[model samples]
Target chain A: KEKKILSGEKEFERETREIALKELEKERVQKEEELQVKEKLQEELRWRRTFLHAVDVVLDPDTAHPDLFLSEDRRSVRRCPFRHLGESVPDNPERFDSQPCVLGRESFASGKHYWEVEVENVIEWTVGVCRDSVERKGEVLLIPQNGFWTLEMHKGQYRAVSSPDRILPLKESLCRVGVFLDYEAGDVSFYNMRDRSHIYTCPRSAFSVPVRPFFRLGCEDSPIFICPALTGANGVTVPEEGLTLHRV
Target chain B: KEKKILSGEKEFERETREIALKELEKERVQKEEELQVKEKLQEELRWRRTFLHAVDVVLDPDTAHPDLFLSEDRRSVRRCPFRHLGESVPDNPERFDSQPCVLGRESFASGKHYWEVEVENVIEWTVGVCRDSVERKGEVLLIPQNGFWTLEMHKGQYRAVSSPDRILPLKESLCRVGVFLDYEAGDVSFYNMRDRSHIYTCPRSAFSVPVRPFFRLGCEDSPIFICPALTGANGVTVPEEGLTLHR
Candidate 1:
């Protein structure tokens, strides 16, 4: 390259513009880091405030099949041996025409929540969470694609309902089941509340909408009760985090 | 004169005993006040934390007469043109076999909670709170003894359901109604949420047991929707005491 001296006025102006641009780049990077930190803090605070704690869940009778009988408090449910007790239930569009299932009246759009069901003396049952969009008029498969995340037990086998259904090995039958939902965090966990023991926890895909507690009765005569919320946490992986979020 | 005293040693012991008795009386009073304040603080904290704010209400279908149709969300209800929907509904003991009413799935035991219901275009409706103990099997009257506290409207008349029913005078109609329950304070208040208007307030006895939201449809085909909770208070008699207890 040939070395040449620049003309005074024009060359000085060009040099000044280059210097200013270099300083602007430095400032931009500084603000960008700040912007990211602010954004991160805002997102962190948003969910921390709305995260679920304890709330009593009541069974919704409208979505339950005709054969499932609900108590007045709407806490206890039992499947009738007869088909719908002579079709005594109304054909609300929300009713499960084929499946013996019901949803909780409470909906959790965001946050963590826990509830329990007494499986005492009950042989077959499933407990989980599902959005309202699940089919209510026809037979439904207990799979995540159907918006269902459930853990079911029949006889001595415990299984997580999924597309590639998972079988859970266990030694004893569950007397009570505790369902924990961390909607935003995309976590669904279960515990054997009889002894405050963890049974199964799986990574649930993040939900874009609210989901309600789900229940299914697989047997006849045996009754299941939605345990009243005592508002205390029993089982947790992170206790020092103060994430009790307990209400079952 | 009349100044009689104990002998030296005995008199000294008597005086000391009297002094101690006086001091004991003072200490008792001091602790009495301390105990009262401590108990008051404990009771105050108990409910301040559990008090209700906003909870989306869903209608209970089992207790509803077969004639009442509930939406899947259990948020909307309308009366069926046919009675008992051809007797398709189960005859659960909780079913209101005689009356066309339904209780909410959520109950309020102690707290100040509020929820709104759309009464738009629906002229005949009753919204209130009732305990589960209310009679469900037969024709029942609406009164405190029956555990119902309601405000209803039909035609140009409005009334509160009580032993001695009270009629309300209104020139216009209500588009939405808000129900506020202060169970511990024994307050069941209703408001016209359309414009955050005040409609009525009544003195309800303190509820020892939990109470559930109550709704009734007197006319057919008119549907009512329970408003989802946005969790902000409106039309409160007390606002600035930071009593929002905001949800």
Candidate 2:
């Protein structure tokens, strides 16, 4: 009987030790997961903070393509039929002499800026930044060497326009696109704002002169809207109908 | 002998239980401290996030007082000697004819705006927002009823200028001041950016017209500089010397 009682005591002790070890392991895993969550939240907060540097991106009417019809508020642009092009459209040097593109009114020489462009309902579009010295009249290569850093959606396909163009294998169509530019850092990045994931980044591209936001639109009646800068405690506001006027 | 053995077993079990409980308590205390630190960091992140809304504020040279000397770039203003005040200063309807004040170049009609002003060298100054229609020619009361919401530091005395003035009991002199305005929300708040603490707030004021940022200066050679918008990941950047031009 004494031997049997001693065995029972040993068994009880062993069981309690196993439980304690398991509990410690479980707590360790939970702690790691909690840290991961905190880190992710901090990263998102940083992005939102960076996004607030969004400037007033207005469509430069002078840079509009002859075939492009700008909205009355000058916040959106769409390509119209060639027949709708009027001779009265002044042949200004600022206007794109060849490409169906337009530049933003404001340009950046130094500092960081972020802006979002709504791509929904558009079949094909290219939005990015170009150096002020980009050629206006001739066939311009959309490369950093030629002072253009851009991404394009051509017939449901997306491509990052660098030298030896990188074809982005996206799982789905991008509804809205975000562009982040660090002038002094020599970095330009594009983001899939819907999934909150990075699409592509152009690193080590030297920007000497003022860089302007550039856009290229194709397809009839498909309006490309310029979303306003994100503000307030919350992040990202939906584009309202009447508030679309940046000039206002 | 059997009873003695039973008591010994009980004592061993009690000791193990106490040890396990002590270890768990230690862990709980450490975890609580860790969580508190995380919370404080998160709060700072939120403040910095809110502070990023600061717009580029430029001083309007047209509205500057005759006694005040605006920097060539129009971002910094200073009270200079009477000798500096000459006939070259243009007299426009927009210029402050009486008070030694100036207005910002940009005015807000709607949405939220936040900006910081460097008051490191200034002894006495008033910083706030005033209606575009606020009297520019004669003596104007810096009150909400008269379309002004401001805080003044006069002769080492701090006061929030409203209909009923409230004395601000500050612990220390503010080196940098932050102004946050929500047009639709009808809120104007001031903060000591050094410690991220609130100084004063004007709540429930109806702002109908576009309101320009207003500034008042006192003391000679004291410079009130409009600090640039915060950039980078951390949100606070010191005022650079030559980057003062906002145009």
Candidate 3:
């Protein structure tokens, strides 16, 4: 009788242990479901942080490629669109818009991100150079837009980041960055608004930057990227992640 | 006898070890004192960040010097300060400013850097294209200030960047950029801002940037920086930051 009682106790213990394990598994699955919900909420939050939108766009050279509605060479790659970012807040200093963001930080940097954020299609006018011929042709000449862009790096990733993210920690120095392009007759160039010089150009893959590239301040050959802003035009906005570079 | 010998050996070892430890301690103190003195004499940097200081300056070509008081030879350079960078903002949208900012995210490739800016200083003024000189001497001219800059690769020690600094990376896609000189004479030479036909000259020491040894941008010749807002001419401030280049 005692042996039989002992066997009965063993069976009971086994059944109880199995029930406990099942309960534990059910709890684990419920926790996983909750985590998924939390992750989805986080993703929505990130998307909300995306500033700017795709507005007007113009391809460089107008005759470069696909943008050439009248010109030939359909579907060329030079036709990059420009977008707009945040609007002027209440504390803005100027009578008009202050801190107008523009095109990708740089051509190479833009490659890292999967967005095409450039300033375009607002309004353009000719200033100096006596572009009577362009005017006679009724072409949109390049001019200056009243407001400029404030660097919104803290808000967004620099396209994507590179390794050794600190060899030249951008925070250490005061780097007021600006880009300008002057294309009177098929001349598309970049410039530094601060020092005002053309950025050096190197031809690599569409997805690569030069090994050692830079622009000399006050250098005419590498002139500043001074592009005339069109009125009522919007700038470019990029929203992506994990943009980075590596050597081929 | 063996125990006595072992004891003697242990005492000798203990004394030698103590002497070595004392010598080490003395060496450490000497080093500490030396380092302290060296550090005290070292120059301490001012507690300020790299701030942007916009100044409204004007560069009058008719009576202005070429160097803008920045060149060693006082030649080739021009005084072309922005009319609204610091002092007064531009009444028109033709002139713009691109004050440098610390690099940020957006451009993570190529490691190249550049500042995209805007300009509207292209004022409407007539200059004689032909060799025929006007009757008036020292004729005033309207010159625009429009240009670009690039990020030169600086090779040295590396460090960590916050939030993926170095936005606006350089790419090979761009072949050439445009430049608008603010000086009256420069405008006359290169009518088209993007034309690279004209010859530009300037000294090296006139800039406040790091002079890297190897890497360089296509802008070999130094440009004449224009001053838009004259000292007492009721200059304009750079009201809006409309000009920028990003990735």
Candidate 4:
């Protein structure tokens, strides 16, 4: 029998270098600066601004700051957000937990963020005929999200439903929902709160808000930091810290 | 009762003020940053950015990105990148929307992610949380996530609970698990990876490839760009780029 070992990382690297060279040959046809490719690569190193992080920039102002970080998981559960139904409970509920709530604070930033979410097991959803054959969707348990937020801020409309009853009305059914928000430049940021997935950079805006915080703004010169402690010690052992630019 | 007093770095400071303030006016003296000052407040402000991103981040934070978890109940299910039982059936069977190729060039960033997503049919989990008990219990099928990539992911998150019987389990069994990564972060990011209840993250360092490519980089930058061609690309229009970043 012949042993077919998979290609190692070394081979992968060699291929990448070869490809870069080919691109240079193809592009250098028109521009003379093509000869200084490697040097340009280094100089362009300072111009790292060319590369875009996997961040979505909202084009339309109307489709701008919309609430809800929806899952685009097409393979698994569809539109509705409710996992482990009739199954076991998740490991971390408090931190990963999410539910809808109105904005309590005054402002926010640009990036992903986490929130102390809450899910109402039973939310009423009207279905069927109002005066004739009316139906209702009751509360349902749901999963929670930890350290999740939007990539960039946008201005858009938001809508949420309770189970499939809204579309095809049935009896009162229950479903899970997570944290939601529609922030502007000066509103909320959608970066990871615990994991710090997204840090700085508000493409066009100065600052944006993704989630709520313990304290609002301090002043222009000095800002006051407020951390919302959920579960125990208002989230201590976790050491929830807010990010502020280091003004040298 | 041995009272284990844990103090906040800030709390401890205010609690024990300078010796002078204590002696002068007993009432004016600060008495430990009001135990729970905001209790009276109806609504408290929520601080963002206290959460981790990437399934890897949630799993081992510092090590390999961990997988998503399932509840003992099978009511809710997280959105898997691939096909699985009880999950939405995929539109394409020939190729995944974001299928990773072996000799395939880097997409956006590089590396592997892991997730043990739970697959259960509320109608199925009549057995229990453990696999052993389920195998001895019975067997039922709903939908299975397709492909080696999909099944491979299941292995990471779903730990078959073994009772003392066979290899198969029944409904109510937290049977399925999954693990994978979004090499290049995008709209479908670790932060947004979840179903109804379960949440996940990937470790940035766990990205298997050392020199992960940036998918967000346009055509002019590199020659080997591939776009994720998974079923999730339902209505998204494709752009003409040399290196197309596939999911």
lDDT of 3 by residue, A26-116 (tens): 7567657755765664453343312221112222221111111111322112212222223222432211121111121122222111111
True lDDT of residue B73, candidate 4: 37
Interface CA RMSD, all predictions? 36.3, 16.0, 27.2, 32.6
A-chain TM-score of every model: 0.69, 0.69, 0.24, 0.20
Ranking by TM-score: 2, 1, 4, 3
**Model 4 residue B127 lDDT score:** 13
Q: What docking tier does model 4 reach?
A: incorrect
Model 1 spans > 4 angstroms off? A1-248, B1-52, B83-87, B162-165, B231-247
TM-score of 2: 0.41
lDDT of 4 by residue, A206-235 (tens): 222133222111112221111221111121
Candidate 2 at B47: error in angstroms? 24
lDDT of 3 by residue, B198-218 (tens): 211111112221211011111
Query: What fnat does each of the candidate structures reach?
Result: 0.00, 0.04, 0.00, 0.00
DockQ for the candidates, in order: 0.01, 0.02, 0.01, 0.01
User: By the lDDT metric, which is better: model 1 or model 4?
Assistant: 1
DockQ of 2: 0.02
lDDT (Cα, 0-100) at B96 in candidate 3: 17
- Taking all chains together, each candidate's TM-score versus the true structure is 0.39, 0.41, 0.19, 0.22
Residues A1-248 of candidate 1 have per-residue lDDT tens digits of 11122234334544554554565467567657755765664453332334235467777677887777789998998887765554656779887878888888976676556766778787788888888787888777887777888888766677766433456667687776777776655767677643345566654366888888888888668888775542112232322112211222
lDDT of 3 at B205: 14
Which whole-number lDDT from 0 to 100 does residue B15 have in model 4?
41
lDDT of 1 by residue, B40-154 (tens): 6546455335524456777767787877778888889888788643466668788888898988886656546677787888868888988878878888888777788888876
